[PDB]
Symmetry: D2
Subunit: 318 residues, 4 copies
Amino acid sequence: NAMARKKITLVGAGNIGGTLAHLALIKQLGDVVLFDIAQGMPNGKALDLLQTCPIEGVDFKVRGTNDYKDLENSDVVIVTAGVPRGMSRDDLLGINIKVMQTVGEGIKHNCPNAFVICITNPLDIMVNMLQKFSGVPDNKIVGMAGVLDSARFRTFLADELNVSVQQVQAYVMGGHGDTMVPLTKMSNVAGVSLEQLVKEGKLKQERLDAIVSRTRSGGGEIVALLKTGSAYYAPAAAGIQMAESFLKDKKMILPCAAKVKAGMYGLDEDLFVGVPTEISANGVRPIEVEISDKEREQLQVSINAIKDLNKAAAEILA
Amino acid sequence: MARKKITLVGAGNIGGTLAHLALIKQLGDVVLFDIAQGMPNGKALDLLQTCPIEGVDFKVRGTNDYKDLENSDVVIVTAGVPRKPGMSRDDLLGINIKVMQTVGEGIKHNCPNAFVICITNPLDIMVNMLQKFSGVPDNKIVGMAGVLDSARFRTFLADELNVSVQQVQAYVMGGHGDTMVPLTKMSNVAGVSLEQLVKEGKLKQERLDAIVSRTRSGGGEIVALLKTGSAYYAPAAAGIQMAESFLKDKKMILPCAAKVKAGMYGLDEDLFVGVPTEISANGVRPIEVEISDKEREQLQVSINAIKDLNKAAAEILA
Amino acid sequence: MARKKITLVGAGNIGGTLAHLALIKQLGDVVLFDIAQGMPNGKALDLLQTCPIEGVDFKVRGTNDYKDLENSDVVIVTAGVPRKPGMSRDDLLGINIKVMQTVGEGIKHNCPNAFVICITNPLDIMVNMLQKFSGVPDNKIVGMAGVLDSARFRTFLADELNVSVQQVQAYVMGGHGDTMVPLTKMSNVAGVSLEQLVKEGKLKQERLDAIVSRTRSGGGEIVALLKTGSAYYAPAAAGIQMAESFLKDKKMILPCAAKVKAGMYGLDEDLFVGVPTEISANGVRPIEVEISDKEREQLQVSINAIKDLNKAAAEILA
Amino acid sequence: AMARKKITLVGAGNIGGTLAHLALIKQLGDVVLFDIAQGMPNGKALDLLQTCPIEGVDFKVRGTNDYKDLENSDVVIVTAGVPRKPGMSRDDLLGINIKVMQTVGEGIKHNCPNAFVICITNPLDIMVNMLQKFSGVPDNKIVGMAGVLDSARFRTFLADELNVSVQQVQAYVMGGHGDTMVPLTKMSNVAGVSLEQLVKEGKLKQERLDAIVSRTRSGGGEIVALLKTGSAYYAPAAAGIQMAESFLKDKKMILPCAAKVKAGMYGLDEDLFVGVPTEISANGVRPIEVEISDKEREQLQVSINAIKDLNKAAAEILA
């Protein structure tokens, strides 16, 4: 019985979505469906992308759609849809919870066994909402966030230290910005921890602090530069990295927004939290690593922000 | 030994996509020039942060300064204003000639030995102008046009006949749209020419005709679907293919706008024409293939349109 | 979702190279089967230890046990003995028929739905025997032969004419050596047929002749240079190209030994013949292309050799 | 018109052919396959060349018996030598191979003195030194492949034991092979969690960890006993190309390699080639000093002593 090609569906055909599509084709991960609510635009992007394929020697296809039925049989669904943020935090959540409702039902009704990667903001709460309305189990939904902060952090360290990105490992948990927890003892260059590099005078403590700080603010930095819109190349790269670990059963461990069970990281209740997460053919699984008292106090900031958003979201739903 | 260097003059969507491709294919360091404030830096920062994910150690930086073109091995020019309603051809010409001047002088003063690929429209004339103001020799300037038409033609063929893009070869000459010359004898699926497939009833002449027509209008088709902007993925793929052929000394023969000396193809004067062109470490060399009488007549149309633009450009410049 | 699985039956140089290529191209897990003790495990271990260097998480293991064939999506068979002095043709057949029986039964009992690519010589007869003892349907067995000849033909043409391998297409039918059928009308460089290039004085008949001949004798040429063994890199590459077309549902059309039904190519009985064959997720399908009277005559020579081996094999089996 | 990169492989046995193949696949440049043996390198080159139309590659490979063909090489990778046969003495082994390094070395000296030189010939501990001595290349343009292989093995074993991507497993070593290998167990880590921490946490049994170290020490011999003929070549070739590729792409990777370390670094008294973290860039190689534990340093001393002894035996042969 002939084997079906892999099928990746991208819900949201903006710049991040088109970039996801392009990477999926180049890496030959499977057929691609580009979904967007906007008429014509997803088709136009699909067609353009499809026409790259003869140049690259690729026979996977890409098609545009405004219809949720076309999510059928998707192995992976990657969600970038939503409305960007003088709009209140209440109104923002309201509009996007709605969008997560629509996307979620689409998933529920058309590919309930898909692996679901959420990129929509605010990621802290949107990943929870998208599970809630799609009904997918804990191990089949994950949010992209840590991998981007880590890519940024690695980028900054590689340039500062003049070393390959392949020897730079940057570890984070928590959210973005002031909710990001940098794991500076475990982060290392070719096995030498960032704190050891300071102690050795190979890296100024000031430089390290500036790099951490620049990583916290990295999205905003690109926004200020772009004048219009936000980062999309690195975010897409992160999403595909994650998708690829699922599709190729790689068992990578990556900082992602994953539902963590009560007890792990001293949590009182199940919560989506940015934590090291295994990604395999079996979906995702959070990993508990030992962290310092300081890093844990910092993790508590994110947990408390997330709890606050969960409460606001509950109120909106009632 | 210096890393290779690709400068992209123009950081619109095509330019950004070129950059992304150059990084994924590890072709060298990339400089993303644009006249706009902040934006080239922002995209370049975003792109540079993909690199840790993809394990790449080539760098990309943004700039407003022609000095950063220094030592570029390749320069791909996408800068220019797209035509709009009710902008006259004279107006588009006037505007883009002046960009070519500014870009030409940047090249001439900062990397006069670069291999220059022109993508700015109207391609029929902008390649000519880019040479005139850069001062680069005939073998070091080339326009991207035919490869895009080819990719589209192959895409449609591959889907129509249900075969791998790797077994579809589409040969064209001339310009876009009504000036394109489809070579239906040379073009073939797995060695069976398109006209032969028609004789065999494996492809209806109507279908071939619709596919030819669709390729002529391919650019406009995507425009109409996008509603904002033009195609950019397939154009970027085409541009990078040509660049790779130079960088890797591949000696591919690709349909490009290259300077053809009086005599070849029956020209009574030197012209930039869309012809099969060898791309190697020595630059470009147009190749004369045998074509039918009919095919020659079609090419005459393009030749006339180029000669016409050449007169218009000369006037504007005086 | 199960990882894809490629079993290589035969862990000689071709088998090892197949395995290496499969790993590099991330096509799935690999099982390296051989009747020899230790050696397949040893190569498999060596190959597995490349993986961290290449960033690949697919696995390779060695085995003596047909049970390890279970669930193989693809099986590529290279097992057999090479002909040697003064071992007769009959001596070889008797030996390799037996291997095919063992291998066939292994396939039948452990992965009867695999797509099977046969490489064992004499290819003209061994694919037939492999199907007979494996019991796999017509659309799931194919022999590698033409693609290797094609590759060589292209190599020589590319060097001779100083052009990219990506603009050289070489089409052949039939078997190797004196049974090969060169298709000089369909074969072309950048859309200009080899014949046309002769008419044009761009390629002397003599050179085309020496290249054709050299392609006929390509296997023996390498044998003579190596002094021990036979070619294996290009054969493995060929094998993996075919496997990839199956795995990625590419629908490439490639010259392969495939079962042709009575009526096609004028056959009065079903035979395995080297013909253009579509490879897709649905397995193989021979394709009839129009060929010249002369070309047809040359194919008849192959057809006669295959009929002769079929009689010789039947006798041995009785 | 810029020249294509040129990689020359001195030795066209299984490792050399494999190095050629990877170089084609990764499109690193034209390849020259040198061997003393008549025909064989040409046969391998032709077979390899004939892969290229299938892969879409326009880089070329050719065979040669002539040192003149090393001209203009950006990188030279040396696998040539005679394998220890039984019952061959250590003296005779050294003697034969020092001679081969002499000939290879002169070839480099006379034909591509600006090449980046990767030595794989055994015993690597001494051959890298000899090859520099006869080629005359400076300290930053010669390097020995050894650590990268041990680390690939170590990572391979860890990834399988822990069910994790090879991309999240970093295994750090210095010193030589086998009993001269120094495992850096505290720096080695899975997704930033050190191997020792994994033990402390019950995620890895100490015994398992010890077995994996031990299996890495013996990893070459494990494959030799399995193959019955010859030794490992896939992973050794992959290691050598990773090294070559960091040079050619100026990657600035830091990799455990046999490099010339200056007196004072790692408490050395004199200049020696030692397996140490080494930066590989377009500027060649540079050893990096990392802090190691007392225990690890004691273990490093075992390699240093074995290297000294070989340097002594080598000098006595030359005199």
